Amino acid sequence: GLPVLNTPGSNQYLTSDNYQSPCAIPEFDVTPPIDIPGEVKNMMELAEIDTMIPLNLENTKRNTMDMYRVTLSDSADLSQPILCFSLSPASDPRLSHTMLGEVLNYYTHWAGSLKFTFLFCGSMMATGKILVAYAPPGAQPPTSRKEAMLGTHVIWDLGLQSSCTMVVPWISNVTYRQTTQDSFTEGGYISMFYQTRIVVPLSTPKSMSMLGFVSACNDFSVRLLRDTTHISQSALPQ
Amino acid sequence: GLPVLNTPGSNQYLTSDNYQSPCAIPEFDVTPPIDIPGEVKNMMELAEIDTMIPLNLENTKRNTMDMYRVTLSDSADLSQPILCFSLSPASDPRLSHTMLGEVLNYYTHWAGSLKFTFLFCGSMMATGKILVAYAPPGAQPPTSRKEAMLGTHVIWDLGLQSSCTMVVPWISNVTYRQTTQDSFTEGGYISMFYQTRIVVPLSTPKSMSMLGFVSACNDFSVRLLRDTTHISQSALPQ
Amino acid sequence: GLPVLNTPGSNQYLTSDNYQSPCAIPEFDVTPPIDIPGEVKNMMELAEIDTMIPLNLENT
Amino acid sequence: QRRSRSESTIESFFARGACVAIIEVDNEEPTTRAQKLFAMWRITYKDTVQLRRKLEFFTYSRFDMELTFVVTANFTNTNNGHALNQVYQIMYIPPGAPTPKSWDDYTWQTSSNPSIFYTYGAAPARISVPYVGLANAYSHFYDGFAKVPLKTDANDQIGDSLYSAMTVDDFGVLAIRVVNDHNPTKVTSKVRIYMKPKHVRVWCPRPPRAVPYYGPGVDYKDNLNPLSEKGLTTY
Amino acid sequence: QRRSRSESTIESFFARGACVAIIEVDNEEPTTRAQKLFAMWRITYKDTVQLRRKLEFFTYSRFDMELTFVVTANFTNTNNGHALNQVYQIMYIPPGAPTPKSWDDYTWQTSSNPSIFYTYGAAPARISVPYVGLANAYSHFYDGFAKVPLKTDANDQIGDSLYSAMTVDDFGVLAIRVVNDHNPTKVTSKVRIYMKPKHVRVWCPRPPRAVPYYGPGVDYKDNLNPLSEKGLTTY
Amino acid sequence: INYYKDSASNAALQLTIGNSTITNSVVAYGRWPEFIRDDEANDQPTEPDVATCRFYTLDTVMWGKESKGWWWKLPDALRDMGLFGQNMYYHYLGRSGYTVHVQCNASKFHQGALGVFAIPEYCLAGDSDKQRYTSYANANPGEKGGKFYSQFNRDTAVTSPKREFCPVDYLLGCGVLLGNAFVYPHQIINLRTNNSATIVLPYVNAMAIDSMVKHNNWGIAILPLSPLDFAQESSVEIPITVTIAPMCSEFNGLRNVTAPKFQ
Amino acid sequence: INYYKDSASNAALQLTIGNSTITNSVVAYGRWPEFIRDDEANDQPTEPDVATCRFYTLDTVMWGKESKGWWWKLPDALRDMGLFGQNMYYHYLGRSGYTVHVQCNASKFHQGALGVFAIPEYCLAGDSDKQRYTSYANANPGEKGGKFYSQFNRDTAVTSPKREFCPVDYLLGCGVLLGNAFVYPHQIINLRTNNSATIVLPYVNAMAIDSMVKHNNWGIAILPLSPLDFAQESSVEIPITVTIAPMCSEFNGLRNVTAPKFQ
Amino acid sequence: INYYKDSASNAALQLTIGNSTITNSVVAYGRWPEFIRDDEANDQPTEPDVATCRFYTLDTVMWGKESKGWWWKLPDALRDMGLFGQNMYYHYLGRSGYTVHVQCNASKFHQGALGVFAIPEYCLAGDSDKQRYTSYANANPGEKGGKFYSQFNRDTAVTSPKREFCPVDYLLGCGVLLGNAFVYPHQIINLRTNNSATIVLPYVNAMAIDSMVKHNNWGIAILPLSPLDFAQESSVEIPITVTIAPMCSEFNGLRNVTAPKFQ
């Protein structure tokens, strides 16, 4: 018949190949689809949904509801930070298990800006001011308000607004950052401090709780699909 | 020659494949066909032909002519049902061996409406009224005329008409129902009751027989061809 | 190269098959034919010729 | 859209390869006693029951055929060495053609009979055949005889014939042999034949079989109680 | 240019072959005691966890499937000779079809059930399947029962059913056997099945699993402390 | 694209007939009997018009409480009916359609139901372990016909086997449930509504024309779907009559007469 | 170029409803409830307009410092609400959307936060080693609903197993971290800003219409994201109320009434 | 014809700058320094114009008969030069080109030749068996620079390894013959013809902008191609001076100041 020549790679099975195969059930009447609410076209759409951050991962509070709450008080040390973490969406323990982190753990490279939100759950009579700062990598991590203010910072007034949003923009030497811990693709640091203090009147609680959320913006992209480390198996079903 | 690359599935035999093969008898003068009555184009055409139902499957009557007859009398208990069964065309023993059931046993999924017919074989002087009811699944199977009448019911007058027809329409949550017994794809129940009673004059038989038939309508379809359980083999011919 | 899939019947030899094969003597000058009497196109032509019947098949 | 009847067509209903024959062939040193060096199988679809039952839904049929051959070989002992890859020969013998009497007689020259040579380990063999019926359609059921006894017949055996049989030898046979010579160790092999009808037309539908088959005809011997017990007023 | 989201699509996210089943089949001399001559596997994707976890990101799905089969065989001893190349038969049995009781019963005729015959040493087998869901979409999660108990039921077992289960027998099974007869030496083999969804649509995204799976349902038994320790004010 | 040349390789009221008159009808497969067309043949046919296409009445039978059924074969039943039989035995090839009329009359105080079925290529089962051993004489009873049975009585004779059929009523004599016999052309006679049945059968066979002596084209089966009863009498019997009219009959292959040996 | 025929082979304010009135809203998936369209069906449906589409109020619950959460199932919670339940039990197939309103009022000196989540196909975990062994009665509490727990308490009974759910607050009762529960339709009630929440749920299922008795389409989960406190008091309790209004409800398959056995 | 979708599968004088003035030039790769274009970026950059783009003079070195060579790293050498260093340490990302001017004057009775080479990604070899063990402090000498050697002196310390470079003159300190070093941008100062050299270096890197602290973009190497001599004197020494001017410098990522630990 037609002369042919077999090339390398013949009779191999590549799990990522895209070829045609015969159908074992020809002439099948497929049930037509219907319009079901909640259709999803891209996985990034899930990364754009805000989800809570387990900020408090202490030994006696992790794996418990209280791990989602950060305590605030009117008698706290104003010279010390309220919370601090690193801009590692997929490797930081406080961000790895979020929906953004769960989606990222299936990919090797990521790029884009991020959005952080903070919700104050005190009484209507409580007032105060807070400072939320982001610092790009390269220098010592901030330990005081004076150092933090030199970065990208936002001032939040609790009384007027119960929620605050800060956008961390994309700034990097490389076009894409790895999803694993690596000093060559470090992202920066996030810190919080008191601006003036929490002030409350009499017959009012002196302690309150705060919540945090994270999400991705519309300029977020991922590369290089890969397996995750968050699920394992030891014995196959019998 | 022409470079080529062999893909997975090469040199395999799939019984449902559709490929070309060489002919072992080239240049054969095939005998032309003729117009023979009774040509069949679709198997559903056979399912649309009415066939008798072995309603009476008692121990001493099954596998015998009497299994196709249902007894009626003028001294019967009017508060008890005459006959009862389930809308399982392929798994119910009383419907599995019908032509519809035989065709369905070769397929895995079915959908469509059904038509049931009842023939009264009494004397011309006998009169009476009957009620034939269908109940969709979900509630207790009917045990009395009061419960049955709440469903889809038809009233049949023996004197005016010796035959009655009831159409069970298609009503289901799923688009297709399985041909095997399954509570998630249950079809419903079929029952019969006396409306007034059988009345006969003197010098006339007081007992009579009734026959039943089933068929499929024009909106009937099947899916997923498969082997049947009605034929088996133990030893190959020697 | 071009993806392909091998089907059943590959590498089999059917005596009634009709395929192309390479020529072992390329560029051969074939002797031209001539008009020879008695050319036959169909075997039925031989069946249309009358022939004697051995009617008497006795032992002797 | 609305539900379709694409898969209930005659073509789809018969678009499956069904086994119709298992044949045994052995390779060993020839001996005086009986052996299985070559085998002959009479072509038909009544050896198995599934395809037979599916086809018997109708009285008359007209179709082409596709045949596929799957070969599986094995050893029997371990102390007689091994063997090299074998080649199998399958020949179609129509009625009237000479039949082999040995695995290496002249009949295997297959000057005019088609033949297939199969090398073990390759893809299963395959061929196609057209409609070769003498009449305008195949007759699954035949209510008649091939001979009619006459008053003038010398004896009653002149006109005796089997009921519901057209021809004694129909469609020929298939002869299977191993071309290779015998190795010091015996090697057994089985050939499985799968049939698929194509371009199928049918006439005169009939009710399906309800009791186990018994012979090529419609005879029944045992298991004549198919239906099971069930209550009259039981759902 | 600007960064794209080509690889984050649903199709790309599921464009990978994932193992879903490892099945064992043995060839040896049949004996009275239990053996692994033929095997039956119930079709599902919950035997493994990676594909299950990826699919459980959404509540409803609709896709076609591609299946690939990889076969690996080996010996067990050394003093019983050797064996010739084997042929494996894989048959799909939908619900309601008869199931085999032996490696050589009539059910293997596969008159209507599709089957694959694979020759050892060739390329891994492959097939494709369309969407065969009874409803308009597959239901990964089902919050309900198949039966409802009633006050008039004679006993409590009439209406008893497992929670979060639609049908007991869904999608049928796959039966795998070795067609070849038994050699004097036993031969073991494993078949690995890899699944790839195609033409995928999804609805109602859900949060991913955070603790080890336990059974077909959403039950959890052990390892309920996923998060690790970390300082509140530690970078 | 198709590569191979061969296609097989390609991947996939009063009715009057003749001098007879009888005073709704069913047409089998919706096909009226017709003569052979010029586009299908194999000499000059002989086509009697009125000397053979007329109603012939068979022997009357009796239906009672213990009756199980009756069966006949065509054209076997008409082998001795006027000139039709003479033409059948004087010609090698024959063809014909049929009209079947079943008569059974009763009163308004009787009750019962008869099912009449026309079956093409109606093959019956034997009565012995040997397969397809039935004799020609036993398979062609004639106008008398045969009867059904409710059980399979195996023949115990070893010296002189009977070689006869053993039809079973609920298996239709061929191993198929009677309930599905309605797939064939059929009629129902219910004593409370009607008293007669009529069917029209065209010529059906794999060949345009075939021998009538060694092959039977049609079978007629009559079975009681409901038992006969009358008032409260212990014994009841009524007559059943059958009439058959050939239609559009052709004959070919004239030669000396055939004389089959019927016992 | 595609070779095979099959596609699979191809390579890849006041709101008033009915006679009820309540004095921003969230629409789930941005889809308002709607009736079935003519291009999707399987008889004449029954579509009550005002006799069933109205607000029904459930039993009030109490929120304190030790409260962990509550959950309800729909349409289970409305099985005994006026004519809606009667239509549910008198028909084989049902369909409906919902409007959920959560009310909780406090003072300016209180503090706390509630999270309300609507979950489609909300499946909960058991309380025993056996898998999927929960009973129908325990899985359908009704309008009373259930409660969450902070730890997994395995059932030690071997003779009379309870067969009940054991939801865990931080796992959402299904093995997923609570922080991601916001992926579902949700609302937050913060006592310092608002005192009520509203959600609109369309009909979601793999089928256009399905039975309401054996399958629950929606689940409602309310959890305290922040603990309740008031001034410096040791004990604080406030009421929480839930109201639900069916919308665009259809029923089909009329027959006798269903009577499930709830204990 | 290409079958696969992916492309990869497809088969294959006075110069014044700022407030500084110096009284032919060589442009590396024929590319003048330029600012980042709008079609390539990753916030608002900071682009000093005259406060950082000006000539800074390094410490003078001495060339004699036994001198083997000198080397410097950029932007390391300018880390403590006015506001350029402050901007370098106050920003995460930086970018800049350079202008290098080498001055060395002698008399007509002197003789010698200097080769100046600008090397991108100039990596030097260590002085120990361990690989890539050089310390940050030793790899960034600053404005003082380093010197070459004529032989490889392996470090014998085992307790306190020096962790320093050991460049070799004839191997260019990187294992390549010096004769081919002219492949890089280069200049030759021959005392009998000229007394100065000038080079212009654009920004070269795999990324548009990168950190200046942890990565050095350029290296400058000066080696004596011919030994220095004067009349018949035994000892001769002359000064060599280096001046560097940043050009088109951009900075981004403002935050607190970085304080590296240099010993």
Ligand SMILES: CCO/N=C/c1ccc(OCC[C@@H](C)CCN2CCN(c3ccncc3)C2=O)cc1
């Ligand atoms: C080199 C070997 O290849 N030759 C193969 C071959 C295969 C089949 C051939 O035809 C055999 C006959 C088939 C067309 C099927 C015959 N059928 C159709 C009708 N029929 C049958 C049997 C018994 N009762 C009624 C009908 C059959 O058995 C001829 C040659």
Ligand SMILES: CCO/N=C/c1ccc(OCC[C@@H](C)CCN2CCN(c3ccncc3)C2=O)cc1
């Ligand atoms: C000759 C052998 O080839 N036959 C092969 C074959 C393969 C697959 C076939 O379909 C099996 C069902 C699949 C389409 C996948 C079923 N899925 C989709 C939804 N689902 C599932 C399971 C458990 N909970 C929820 C959903 C499944 O397990 C049919 C035939």
Ligand SMILES: N[C@@H](CCC(=O)N[C@@H](CS)C(=O)NCC(=O)O)C(=O)O
């Ligand atoms: N080592 C185990 C079997 C290991 C096993 O089956 N592992 C599963 C998951 S726990 C698997 O994914 N195996 C992949 C493979 O080896 O093919 C045994 O034989 O006792």
Ligand SMILES: N[C@@H](CCC(=O)N[C@@H](CS)C(=O)NCC(=O)O)C(=O)O
């Ligand atoms: N086990 C039997 C043979 C079994 C057999 O031949 N079975 C037939 C039908 S009863 C069959 O379909 N076999 C399929 C196959 O094994 O290839 C024996 O060897 O004694």
